[PDB]
Amino acid sequence: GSHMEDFVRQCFNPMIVELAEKAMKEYGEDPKIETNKFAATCTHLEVCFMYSDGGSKHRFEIIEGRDRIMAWTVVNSICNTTGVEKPKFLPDLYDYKENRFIEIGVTRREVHIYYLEKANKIKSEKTHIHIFSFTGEEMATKADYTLDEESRARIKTRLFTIRQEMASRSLWDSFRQSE
Amino acid sequence: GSHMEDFVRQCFNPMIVELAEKAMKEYGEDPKIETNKFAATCTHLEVCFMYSDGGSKHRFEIIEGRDRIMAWTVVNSICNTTGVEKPKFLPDLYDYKENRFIEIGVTRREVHIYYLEKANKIKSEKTHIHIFSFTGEEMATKADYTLDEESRARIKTRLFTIRQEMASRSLWDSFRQSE
Amino acid sequence: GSHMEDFVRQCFNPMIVELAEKAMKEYGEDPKIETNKFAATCTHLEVCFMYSDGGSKHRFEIIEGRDRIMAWTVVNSICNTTGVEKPKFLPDLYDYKENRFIEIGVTRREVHIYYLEKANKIKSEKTHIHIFSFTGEEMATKADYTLDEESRARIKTRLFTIRQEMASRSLWDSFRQSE
Amino acid sequence: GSHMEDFVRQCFNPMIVELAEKAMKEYGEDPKIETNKFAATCTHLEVCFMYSDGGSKHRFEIIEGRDRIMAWTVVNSICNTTGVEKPKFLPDLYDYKENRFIEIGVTRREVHIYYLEKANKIKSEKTHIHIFSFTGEEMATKADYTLDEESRARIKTRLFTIRQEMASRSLWDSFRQSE
Ligand SMILES: O=C1CCCN1CC[C@H](C[C@H](C[C@@H](CCN1CCCC1=O)N1CCCC1=O)N1CCCC1=O)N1C=CCC1=O
Ligand SMILES: O=C1CCCN1CC[C@H](C[C@H](C[C@@H](CCN1CCCC1=O)N1CCCC1=O)N1CCCC1=O)N1C=CCC1=O
Ligand SMILES: O=C1CCCN1CC[C@H](C[C@H](C[C@@H](CCN1CCCC1=O)N1CCCC1=O)N1CCCC1=O)N1C=CCC1=O
Ligand SMILES: O=C1CCCN1CC[C@H](C[C@H](C[C@@H](CCN1CCCC1=O)N1CCCC1=O)N1CCCC1=O)N1C=CCC1=O
Ligand SMILES: [Mn+2]
Ligand SMILES: [Mn+2]
Ligand SMILES: [Mn+2]
Ligand SMILES: [Mn+2]
């Protein structure tokens, strides 16, 4: 019965909390035990949804938040209709306007560090990467940040707020030092 | 009690399913017996609605999905107020921005083939044709595709997803080979 | 218990029907007895609302549809803050973008005829007039039609549909010849 | 049991009334006793919300209307991510598009007078000020009025309407002469 678990449930929206619970159980993880991961999973969902909401009405397909199987089905349809290359790991969105997949990251360290780790991992000459930290930095492939400034600013604002809420509950250091 | 019938009811939205049922009974067809047609009818409704949703707020009148009589009443009002020519077969939308009717098609073969068949049929020097296939092709009158790229991409994505769902249930070949 | 009364209640939206009933009782008229006026009042409400919906989000103040007293209060605030001249008769909208009041008319005759009658009546060097007929014509002050083409086309479409519905019930001639 | 209290509850939206009640109790004030302040607090909330609604979708963060603590948390996140200077008094919005805080004022006197008082108070070389009166004037830092004309016009309209409602109840002079 952790403080972090109760904190997450009052910080994030109930739909986000339930998608995060569903995602963690799919990969065999327990949200009551791995409560830092529970927070991170919610955070990442939220960001990905605020991101898709920047931009014009039909711009993004949302991959993140779906069941694994359906997410891959949607990736294949997209691959099979734009001719874009099939990613090896599930990305988070597809950008119909620039014809590319996007991998959104959210990190409690240097973006430099998390970007390289993502780059190396997916090795998809194609897929765009976009990282945000909890201290306001972002880093994106070819310095091309996809959305305009006001929509990314909102996300960075929301991340700093989450950090403050954690810190004022004394949960921030345990969260920071378990990434 | 076919697998296809239950598949359609979980693939499409309930409002689409009910309009499709209404349309088939109007033409004396039974959705429980002619289950490929039931799928096609849902598909065509869906596409036509995703199509009207591309574009700016007042752009399209939606003809498809209405009762026959009301659909013709709306066609006549449009004819009677823009001076456009009265079509012989009901189209699916009217484009207020380009002042033309549009016939949307969705095909399980070559678009070349289905386009000619539509052309020949309506013989309306006026009415624009726009076909989509389930393998991502589209074809439109004067190569003028009406909407921008992202809205048509979404439709082609959704069609490929429907195809995958059918195939993973072993319904795809029976659907493909009954068009 | 007229056919026209039941026709109006199934043709127009319930909120429009209730505002029309409220407006007629304010001027001492009975919607069950004066059923042509009941139709016209609904029609005029509808049009004025479809009109305000053309244009960008804050463009119009809606005067029509309010209680008399509140409508005048809103006119005075507008006069008292833009310095525009106080109209003698209640108009239907205010255009914040062009800084003028608008009088919307809907006629079962020549627009030429109804426009002059409106002009003469309000004598407001200032207030813009915009008439629509049920046969698709419109006429506006300085040939300046305020909205773009697609939003006015929709209105003219809806008016022709109302006319057809009346005619197929044999109510059209009585409505036409009582304006 | 004042007339002003009942007037406010029928003039303003219930959500605004409840936020105003919450704000006044936070600063130890009683909405039943200080009924002019209750009106002013509602007015100021309303304006600030109509203001945030002018502009494009992600443009403003809304600070006003939150609990004190959360409002400061949001200010800090914004400061901590845009590098803008921390204000000493809580502002009402943040403008992501121009990267500044905004202090909205609403006054029953000369805007000249209320602007100086605000200027002097916050002494934030940075924060933009935007005053509206109940007689239609506005005044803003560097004559830069943030929103376009139609959105500010709406606000000034609404303020004059509130003034008229008060005056026709004989509450206006007591409200005017207690600011
Ligand atoms: O907080 C808000 C503000 C506006 C509405 N809303 C509710 C939640 C949506 C996300 C959900 C996303 C979720 C919802 C679950 N499902 C399953 C059936 C279809 C659907 O939408 N989806 C969309 C497809 C993939 C996926 O995982 N969104 C974003 C698009 C509209 C919506 O509900 N959202 C959008 C901005 C932030 C946010 O949380
Ligand atoms: O899935 C969604 C996302 C946004 C809302 N929604 C519900 C269904 C609407 C279509 C219906 C169409 C249908 C609805 C039935 N009726 C009868 C009375 C009026 C009305 O709308 N219409 C519109 C006129 C002709 C016709 O057959 N649409 C499209 C426009 C808004 C709406 O409900 N829709 C729009 C995009 C895909 C889709 O399915
Ligand atoms: O059919 C639709 C499609 C979109 C929503 N909707 C419901 C009715 C609204 C009009 C009402 C107007 C009415 C509603 C009654 N009231 C009294 C309290 C505030 C309010 O709105 N108003 C607006 C101020 C003056 C007036 O008479 N509209 C238009 C603006 C949003 C709305 O509800 N509407 C807008 C397009 C056609 C139409 O009928
Ligand atoms: O009258 C209308 C027309 C459109 C919707 N709506 C309801 C009230 C909203 C304000 C509320 C603001 C309030 C609502 C309370 N909360 C607490 C949880 C999140 C939230 O929204 N917020 C937003 C964040 C800070 C704050 O105090 N707004 C403005 C944005 C959408 C909304 O509900 N609003 C927007 C234009 C005038 C107005 O009164
Ligand atoms: Mn990611
Ligand atoms: Mn068709
Ligand atoms: Mn009128
Ligand atoms: Mn203020």
Author numbering:
A (entry chain A), B (entry chain A), C (entry chain A), D (entry chain A): -2 to 53, 73 to 195
What wording appears in the published article?
The influenza virus RNA-dependent RNA polymerase (RdRp) is a trimeric complex with multiple active sites and functionalities. The acidic polymerase (PA) protein component of the RdRp plays a critical role in viral gene transcription by mediating the process by which the polymerase performs “cap snatching” from host messenger mRNAs. The RdRp endonuclease activity that is necessary for this to occur is located within the ≈200-residue N-terminal domain of PA (PAN). RO-7 is a next-generation PA endonuclease inhibitor of influenza A and B viruses, but its drug resistance potential is unknown.
To determine whether the I38T mutation has any structural effect in the absence of bound RO-7, we determined the 2.2-Å crystal structure of holo-I38T PAN. Compared to the holo-WT structure, there are no significant effects on the active-site locale, although one small difference is that the Mn2+ ion at the documented low-affinity site is not present. However, it is noticeable that the side chain of Thr38 is rotated compared to the RO-7 structure, which emphasizes the importance of maximizing the hydrophobic interaction surface when the inhibitor binds. Through serial passage of influenza A(H1N1) viruses in MDCK cells under selective pressure of RO-7, we identified an I38T substitution within the PA endonuclease domain that conferred in vitro resistance to RO-7 (up to a 287-fold change in 50% effective concentration [EC50]). While Ile38 does not have a crucial role in coordinating the endonuclease active site, the switch to threonine does affect the polymerase activity of some viruses and influences RO-7 affinity for the PAN target (i.e., the ≈200-residue N-terminal domain of PA).
